[PDB]
RNA sequence: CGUGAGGGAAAGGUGAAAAGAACCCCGGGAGGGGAGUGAAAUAGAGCCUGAAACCGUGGGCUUACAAGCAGUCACGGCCCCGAGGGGUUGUGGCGUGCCUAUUGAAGCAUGAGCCGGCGACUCACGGUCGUGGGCGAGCUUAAGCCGUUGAGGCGGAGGC
RNA sequence: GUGGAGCCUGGGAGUGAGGGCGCGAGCGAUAACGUCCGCGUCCGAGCGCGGGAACAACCGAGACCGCCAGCUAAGGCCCCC
RNA sequence: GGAUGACCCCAGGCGGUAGGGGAGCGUUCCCGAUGCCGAUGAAGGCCGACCCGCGAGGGCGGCUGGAGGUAAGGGAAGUGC
């Protein structure tokens, strides 16, 4: 290969246009039906250790 | 660039470095290098014609004469060395210190007494020069300094 | 009333932590806490600490009520970079910049 | 003392019947009307001309042997994608495109010129659907 | 005595940068790109000060042409008829009358017909 | 009424009450000048061939000024040619008193 | 840095005074918020001033049918300050970067990422013209000597 | 014939790679955006302006500044214009 | 014209590379200055749609800054990227 190289410096406009796809999506969160805390769905509540109505995990 | 402290080594090869060519870091294109046409110790003196300085001397005194600012004095009655002594005299002679005065006299006691007044420049007549004449608004001279002046412009 | 915290010289690249700060700008203090707790970014840890600091400033020093607090403004500034050598092939040294961040959070009271 | 500039004009709808007219000599006039240069208040940087409806665009007329020798072409961007359609076949298939192509080639290029093209409504056959606008028939 | 640059260059650069406010990208932010853009801007303004005179005359003429044809004659004949009538209302005012005072413009059309 | 006058080598529709900048005329402020008339319009309608004999527009000179400064700049590439010229066009500001005719 | 001879940096400034911020709060710490000091604390030690490139936050105007050396001329829309002006730009007209080198460059020929700072026609002595003054068949001193301590004079050897 | 004419004395240069075109010749092949001279022109240095689709030297014409005024030049006047 | 730049009148010239010439701006330093501006705020910085100047530039006003600056007229250069 012959070492390809940027022909022109990217403008402030183009560099930031490229990053129009970089924003984070916020975490998907739902209230835990036992302790009302916000937690990811289909995961054991990290605050009261409950899942599927029963206690699974010590917290 | 020859009087600067660095060595005459060529900092990197002439060719094939991708960088500009350079010799030694004393060259004036380097920060910290020699300076190209900076000042060197110089003598600014020159021999102005004797007649020209003699003419200027007499003209500069004539100017004050034509203005009414040339005063000649017999002697300095009261003054014997003390600033307040000369001050008393200068008040009797219309020298209140509202105008600057070139005081030309061979009497050193008189010169010692006046030389600290901000409005007075002191000279012995052998030092009479045009710059100090034109510097000052008035010209006060001994008859003994008036005599020296006449002898020099002749 | 406004209350502010600033974490200065946090040793993390400004571009990375800004992604985290964009999540909570304009958010209520409680939503921001839950958002930061499950953000899979190193910078959630730093942004959380400044958010919690500022909310403690708002309650303890500025007569602001916790349950009214939202992120009225937040932003990341660049601190002085730590420059370090990265050896490369063929006797060449590169300079790696380990960038630093100033992290500002400003809280207000959403009267509702 | 500063040249007059009109406030946004209320456009006029005109109706032209193309039957028997010469293709280019009619396009030239539709171009004028779309540009609105027949209006004493003409302004080069606004759509303020007329709306022009045309019927019987399939009965346009042409001189010489242009029915067989006039070749519209389209290039698709692909190797060998230069398509050649004679005027005969175009009248046989998409007749309204004939007057449309000729009018468009006489409008200005750029944003405004593309908009004034949208103010042209070309139809084959005697009928047209713009009864709503009540177009004033024009003898051109 | 030594006379380093001091303030001189930063103040020259700022003059140019101020004049370049509004330009795109480094053309308003880099002294060098600003200066190159301003060289062009000055030349265009000179050339377009000349061109503005021609641009407006042509707009007057097209408008006068439309006002004339509403009376069954064309611009080139109107102008010759005004010449033979000795009327010297210019194209700026012809156009304006043509828009604001149709009745006066019509009078002027008659003079130009009568004077062929 | 309105009137087309000619001053400073240019033509202007004027009516009473109008303030107008024209090229610099030689008159002290506050005096009055008479402008030639090429056409009268409005109620009556008179057509100069080229100037209307009796007609006149009286205008008070409000005063004189210099236009806003224009940057006259010239540049030739690859030839180190640059010119910078500041231009302010003199003018007179007139108030139209009456159309006499 | 180099085996060695040898090469050879960068790096100055709180404030009048440490009065250099007790104590409380968040935080493991760093850091910050209050309190306090101070004439001043975006003088808080990463300290006078604090430009520019560069990065970010907020607001005004604007932008997803559009063809561009990026501007300019014109007109209209919005926003702002109060027969005017500023900011912005939708549309229309026009329009081939700078420098260098060349017969000829936008040129697909050279150089430049961008900003700030350093960076190139000088000095001595002679010469030659021109020029401002002094003297004029004459003009002029050199080294030194005396004086002065930013005073000037003497010195005629010599040179033209 | 009073012209950024001319002549004389002196100071300061830069240039000593030209190019295109018309005409006149040589060389070449009654070839070259070819080469070499002569007379002239323009570009060079007028890559400033109008025309010639675009285009240093073809046609028009020598840009001190301003004007939203008028007349013309080459070239144009069906639409883009 | 008035009378030796006192300003006015009318007229004509004013594209430009190498290059010749003329007039100015600004930077550092010296005389002016034992002066004068300055904490009621120096220099420097950041704005300005205002004033003067063809222009290089000079003013003025608001903010920053916190201790210097320096006229009319002249002199000298490490003088403008
Ligand atoms: Mg390969
Ligand atoms: Mg390979
Ligand atoms: Mg390989
Ligand atoms: Mg590679
Ligand atoms: Mg490149
Ligand atoms: Mg790139
Ligand atoms: Mg760039
Ligand atoms: Mg940008
Ligand atoms: Mg950005
Ligand atoms: Mg991109
Ligand atoms: Mg990406
Ligand atoms: Mg997101
Ligand atoms: Mg749930
Ligand atoms: Mg040496
Ligand atoms: Mg050495
Ligand atoms: Mg050494
Ligand atoms: Mg050596
Ligand atoms: Mg050496
Ligand atoms: Mg060596
Ligand atoms: Mg050696
Ligand atoms: Mg080298
Ligand atoms: Mg090499
Ligand atoms: Mg390289
Ligand atoms: Mg290099
Ligand atoms: Mg380099
Ligand atoms: Mg070197
Ligand atoms: Mg080095
Ligand atoms: Mg050296
Ligand atoms: Mg040094
Ligand atoms: Mg040297
Ligand atoms: Mg040297
Ligand atoms: Mg010196
Ligand atoms: Mg000398
Ligand atoms: Mg002698
Ligand atoms: Mg004294
Ligand atoms: Mg003393
Ligand atoms: Mg004194
Ligand atoms: Mg003294
Ligand atoms: Mg003394
Ligand atoms: Mg003494
Ligand atoms: Mg003494
Ligand atoms: Mg005096
Ligand atoms: Mg990340
Ligand atoms: Mg996540
Ligand atoms: Mg915390
Ligand atoms: Mg709390
Ligand atoms: Mg490696
Ligand atoms: Mg590696
Ligand atoms: Mg190795
Ligand atoms: Mg890098
Ligand atoms: Mg790096
Ligand atoms: Mg950093
Ligand atoms: Mg911050
Ligand atoms: Mg009008
Ligand atoms: Mg027809
Ligand atoms: Mg239209
Ligand atoms: Mg239109
Ligand atoms: Mg046919
Ligand atoms: Mg076009
Ligand atoms: Mg310098
Ligand atoms: Mg400096
Ligand atoms: Mg500077
Ligand atoms: Mg500055
Ligand atoms: Mg700018
Ligand atoms: Mg800007
Ligand atoms: Mg803009
Ligand atoms: Mg920009
Ligand atoms: Mg910038
Ligand atoms: Mg220019
Ligand atoms: Mg141009
Ligand atoms: Mg112009
Ligand atoms: Mg032009
Ligand atoms: Mg013209
Ligand atoms: Mg028309
Ligand atoms: Mg005519
Ligand atoms: Mg006319
Ligand atoms: Mg109307
Ligand atoms: Mg005017
Ligand atoms: Mg005028
Ligand atoms: Mg009259
Ligand atoms: Mg200009
Ligand atoms: Mg040019
Ligand atoms: Mg050029
Ligand atoms: Mg160029
Ligand atoms: Mg060019
Ligand atoms: Mg050049
Ligand atoms: Mg050239
Ligand atoms: Mg140039
Ligand atoms: Mg020049
Ligand atoms: Mg010039
Ligand atoms: Mg300029
Ligand atoms: Mg070692
Ligand atoms: Mg080695
Ligand atoms: Mg070692
Ligand atoms: Mg070595
Ligand atoms: Mg050092
Ligand atoms: Mg500092
Ligand atoms: Mg200090
Ligand atoms: Mg103090
Ligand atoms: Mg404690
Ligand atoms: Mg505590
Ligand atoms: Mg804790
Ligand atoms: Mg704690
Ligand atoms: Mg630990
Ligand atoms: Mg602490
Ligand atoms: Mg805090
Ligand atoms: Mg603290
Ligand atoms: Mg206090
Ligand atoms: Mg503080
Ligand atoms: Mg500050
Ligand atoms: Mg401070
Ligand atoms: Mg201080
Ligand atoms: Mg600071
Ligand atoms: Mg700072
Ligand atoms: Mg800053
Ligand atoms: Mg900044
Ligand atoms: Mg920010
Ligand atoms: Mg923004
Ligand atoms: Mg916004
Ligand atoms: Mg389309
Ligand atoms: Mg759109
Ligand atoms: Mg577009
Ligand atoms: Mg668009
Ligand atoms: Mg431009
Ligand atoms: Mg445009
Ligand atoms: Mg227009
Ligand atoms: Mg506006
Ligand atoms: Mg506008
Ligand atoms: Mg739009
Ligand atoms: Mg175009
Ligand atoms: Mg281009
Ligand atoms: Mg340039
Ligand atoms: Mg070359
Ligand atoms: Mg070559
Ligand atoms: Mg050349
Ligand atoms: Mg290339
Ligand atoms: Mg290129
Ligand atoms: Mg190459
Ligand atoms: Mg290139
Ligand atoms: Mg080469
Ligand atoms: Mg180069
Ligand atoms: Mg580089
Ligand atoms: Mg670099
Ligand atoms: Mg840049
Ligand atoms: Mg630079
Ligand atoms: Mg020399
Ligand atoms: Mg030297
Ligand atoms: Mg010298
Ligand atoms: Mg000499
Ligand atoms: Mg000599
Ligand atoms: Mg000499
Ligand atoms: Mg001499
Ligand atoms: Mg003499
Ligand atoms: Mg004599
Ligand atoms: Mg001549
Ligand atoms: Mg001559
Ligand atoms: Mg000659
Ligand atoms: Mg001769
Ligand atoms: Mg001669
Ligand atoms: Mg001679
Ligand atoms: Mg010379
Ligand atoms: Mg040569
Ligand atoms: Mg030779
Ligand atoms: Mg020739
Ligand atoms: Mg030849
Ligand atoms: Mg030859
Ligand atoms: Mg030839
Ligand atoms: Mg050619
Ligand atoms: Mg030929
Ligand atoms: Mg022929
Ligand atoms: Mg021959
Ligand atoms: Mg053959
Ligand atoms: Mg040839
Ligand atoms: Mg040939
Ligand atoms: Mg031949
Ligand atoms: Mg020739
Ligand atoms: Mg030419
Ligand atoms: Mg050209
Ligand atoms: Mg070209
Ligand atoms: Mg050229
Ligand atoms: Mg041409
Ligand atoms: Mg052309
Ligand atoms: Mg062609
Ligand atoms: Mg051409
Ligand atoms: Mg040409
Ligand atoms: Mg020609
Ligand atoms: Mg011909
Ligand atoms: Mg001329
Ligand atoms: Mg011309
Ligand atoms: Mg001329
Ligand atoms: Mg005509
Ligand atoms: Mg003709
Ligand atoms: Mg045609
Ligand atoms: Mg077209
Ligand atoms: Mg076209
Ligand atoms: Mg037409
Ligand atoms: Mg004149
Ligand atoms: Mg003349
Ligand atoms: Mg003149
Ligand atoms: Mg010239
Ligand atoms: Mg000094
Ligand atoms: Mg002093
Ligand atoms: Mg005071
Ligand atoms: Mg005070
Ligand atoms: Mg200073
Ligand atoms: Mg300042
Ligand atoms: Mg100028
Ligand atoms: Mg200024
Ligand atoms: Mg104030
Ligand atoms: Mg200040
Ligand atoms: Mg002090
Ligand atoms: Mg000074
Ligand atoms: Mg002075
Ligand atoms: Mg230098
Ligand atoms: Mg100088
Ligand atoms: Mg400069
Ligand atoms: Zn739970």
Annotate E40-61 with DSSP letters as a single string.
HHHHHHHHHHHHHHHHHHHHHH
How far apart are alpha carbons A24 and A39 in whole angstroms? 18
**Probe site for chain A from C18, C22, C38 (most A CB atoms < 10 A):** C38
In chain D, the DSSP E strands lie at 13-17, 51-55, 71-75, 82-86, 120-122, 136-137
Contact A24 C22 (CB under 8 A): yes
Distance set, CA C83 to CA C98, D78, F23 (Å): 6, 52, 67
How far apart are alpha carbons F42 and F2 in whole angstroms? 6
How far apart are alpha carbons C64 and C62 in whole angstroms? 5
Question: Beta F37-41 vs F2-7: how paired, if at all?
Answer: antiparallel
Q: What is the SS3 assignment for chain F?
A: CEEEEEECCEEEEECCCCEEEECCCCCCCCCEEEECEEEEECCCCEECCCCCCCCCEEEEEEEEEECCCEEEEEEECCCCEEEEEEECCEEEEEEEEEECC
Pick the closest to residue C35 from B108, A46, A25 (CA basis): A25
- Chain H, protein-covered positions (CB within 7 A): 45-49, 64-71, 77-81
| Resolution stated for this PDB structure, in Å | 2.3
Give the distance from residue E35's alpha carbon to the nearest chain A alpha carbon, in angstroms: 19
Structure tokens that stand for C99 in this block: 């960038």
Cβ–Cβ under 8 Å, residues F67 and F100? no
Question: Beta F70-76 vs F81-87: how paired, if at all?
Answer: antiparallel
Nearest CA in chain E to F12: E93
Alpha-carbon dihedral sign for residues B84, B85, B86, B87: positive
In chain A, the DSSP E strands lie at 30-31, 38-39, 50-51, 54-55
Query: Hey, is E95 helix, strand or coil?
Result: helix
* Gap from D126 CA to G32 C1', Å: 82
CB-based contacts of A57, cutoff 8 Å, min separation 6: A44, A49, A51
Pick the closest to residue D118 from D62, D57, D50, D28 (CA basis): D50
Nearest CA in chain C to A40: C38
Contact C38 A27 (CB under 8 A): yes
Contact list, F13 vs chain D (CB under 8 Å): 1
How far apart are alpha carbons D94 and C19 in whole angstroms? 55
- Do A and C make contact via 3 or more CB pairs under 8 A? The reply is yes
Experimental method used, please? X-ray
How far apart are alpha carbons D16 and E50 in whole angstroms? 41
- F19 at the D interface (CB within 8 A)? no
Residue C4: in which H helix or E strand, if any?
A: strand C3-10
Question: In this structure, how many other beta carbons lie within 10 angstroms of the beta carbon of residue B26?
Answer: 17
Cβ–Cβ under 8 Å, residues F93 and F19? yes
- Report the separation in Å between the CA atom of B10 and the middle of ligand 93, taken as the mean of its atom positions: 13
Angle between helices E31-69 and E8-19 (to 10 degrees): 30
Taking 3-state DSSP, the helix, strand and coil percentages for chain C, each rounded to the nearest 5, stand at 40, 35, 25
Contact E85 F39 (CB under 8 A): no
Contact D37 E69 (CB under 8 A): no
Span C2-110 CATH architecture: Alpha-Beta Complex (3.90)
Q: Among chain D residues 100 through 139, which have CB within 7 angstroms of nucleic chain H?
A: 105-109, 113
DSSP notation for C42-85: THHHHHHHHHHHHHHHHHHTS---GGGEEEEEEEEEE-PPEEEE
Q: Is F1 exposed, middle or buried (0-12, 13-18, 19+ CB in 10 A)?
A: middle
CB-based contacts of C74, cutoff 8 Å, min separation 6: C21, C24, C25, C47, C103, C104, C105, C106
- Domain chopping of chain C, boundaries: 2-110
How far does CA C88 lie from the centroid of its chain? 34
* Gap from E18 CA to I49 C1', Å: 13
How far does CA C63 lie from the centroid of its chain? 23
Pick the closest to residue F95 from F15, F3, F38 (CA basis): F15
Closest nt to D47 (CA→C1')? G91
Q: Is B104 exposed, middle or buried (0-12, 13-18, 19+ CB in 10 A)?
A: buried
């Amino acid at each position: 290969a012959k070492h390809p190289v940027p022909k022109k410096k990217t403008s402030k406009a183009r560099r930031d246009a490229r990053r129009s796809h970089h924003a984070l999506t916020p975490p998907t969160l739902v209230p835990c039906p036992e302790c009302k805390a916000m937690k990811p769905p289909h995961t054991v509540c990290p605050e009261c250790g409950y899942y599927a109505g029963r206690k699974v995990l010590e917290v | 660039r020859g009087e600067v402290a660095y060595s005459g080594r060529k900092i990197w090869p002439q060719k094939h470095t991708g960088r500009a060519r350079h010799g030694d870091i004393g060259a004036p294109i380097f920060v910290g290098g020699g300076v190209v046409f900076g000042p060197k110790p110089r003598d600014y003196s020159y021999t102005l014609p004797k007649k020209v300085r003699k003419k200027g001397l007499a003209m500069a005194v004539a100017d004050r004469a034509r203005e009414g600012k040339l005063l000649l004095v017999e002697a300095f009655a009261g003054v014997n060395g003390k600033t307040k002594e000369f001050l008393a005299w200068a008040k009797e002679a219309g020298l209140d210190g509202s105008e600057s005065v070139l005081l030309v006299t061979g009497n050193e006691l008189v010169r010692r007494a006046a030389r600290n007044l901000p409005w007075v420049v002191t000279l012995a007549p052998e030092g009479l020069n045009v710059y100090d004449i034109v510097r000052t608004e008035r010209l006060v001279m001994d008859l003994d300094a008036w005599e020296v002046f006449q002898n020099r412009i002749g | 009333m406004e209350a502010k915290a600033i974490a200065r010289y946090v040793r993390i690249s400004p571009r990375k932590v800004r992604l985290v700060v964009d999540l909570i700008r304009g958010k209520s203090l409680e939503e921001a806490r839950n958002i930061l707790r499950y953000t899979n970014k190193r910078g959630a840890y730093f942004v959380a600490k400044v958010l919690e600091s500022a909310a403690a400033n708002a309650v303890n020093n500025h007569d602001m009520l916790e349950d009214r607090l939202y992120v009225k403004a937040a932003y990341v500034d660049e601190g002085p970079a730590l420059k370090r050598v990265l050896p490369r092939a063929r006797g060449r040294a590169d300079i790696i910049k380990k960038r630093t961040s100033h992290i500002t959070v400003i809280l207000g009271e959403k009267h509702g | 003392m500063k040249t007059y500039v009109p406030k946004q004009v209320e456009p006029r709808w005109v109706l032209i019947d193309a039957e028997g007219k010469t293709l280019g000599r009619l396009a030239t006039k539709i171009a004028t009307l779309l540009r609105g240069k027949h209006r004493p208040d003409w302004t080069p940087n606004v759509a303020m001309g007329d709306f022009v409806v045309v019927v019987n665009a399939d009965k346009i007329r042409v001189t010489g042997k242009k029915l067989e020798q006039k070749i519209y072409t389209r290039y698709s961007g692909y190797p060998g994608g230069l398509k050649k359609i004679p005027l005969e076949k175009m009248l046989a298939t998409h007749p309204e495109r004939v007057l449309e192509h000729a009018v468009k080639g006489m409008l200005p290029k750029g944003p405004l010129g593309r908009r004034l093209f949208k103010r042209l409504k070309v139809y084959a056959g005697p009928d047209h659907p713009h009864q709503a606008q009540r177009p004033e028939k024009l003898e051109v | 005595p030594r006379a380093k640059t001091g303030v001189v260059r930063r103040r020259k650069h700022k003059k140019i940068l101020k004049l370049a406010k509004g330009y795109w990208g480094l053309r308003s932010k880099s002294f060098r790109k600003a200066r190159e853009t301003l060289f062009a801007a000055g030349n265009y303004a000179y050339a377009h000060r000349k061109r503005r005179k021609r641009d407006f005359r042509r707009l007057w003429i097209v408008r006068i042409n439309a006002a004339c044809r509403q009376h069954g004659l064309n611009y080139s004949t109107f102008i010759h008829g005004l010449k033979k009538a000795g009327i010297e209302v210019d194209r700026k005012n012809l156009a304006d009358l043509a828009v604001r005072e149709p009745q006066v413009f019509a009078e002027l059309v008659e003079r130009a017909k009568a004077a062929q | 009424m309105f009137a087309i006058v000619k001053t400073g080598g240019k033509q202007y529709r004027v009516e009473p009450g109008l303030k107008l900048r024209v090229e610099k005329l030689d008159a002290e402020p506050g005096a009055t000048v008479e402008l030639p008339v090429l056409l009268l319009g409005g109620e009556k309608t008179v057509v100069g061939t080229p100037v209307v004999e009796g007609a006149s527009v009286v205008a008070e000179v409000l005063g004189h000024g210099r236009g806003k400064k224009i940057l006259v700049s010239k540049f030739k590439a690859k030839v180190q040619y640059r010119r910078k010229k500041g231009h302010r066009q003199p003018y007179t500001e007139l108030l139209i008193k009456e159309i006499r005719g």
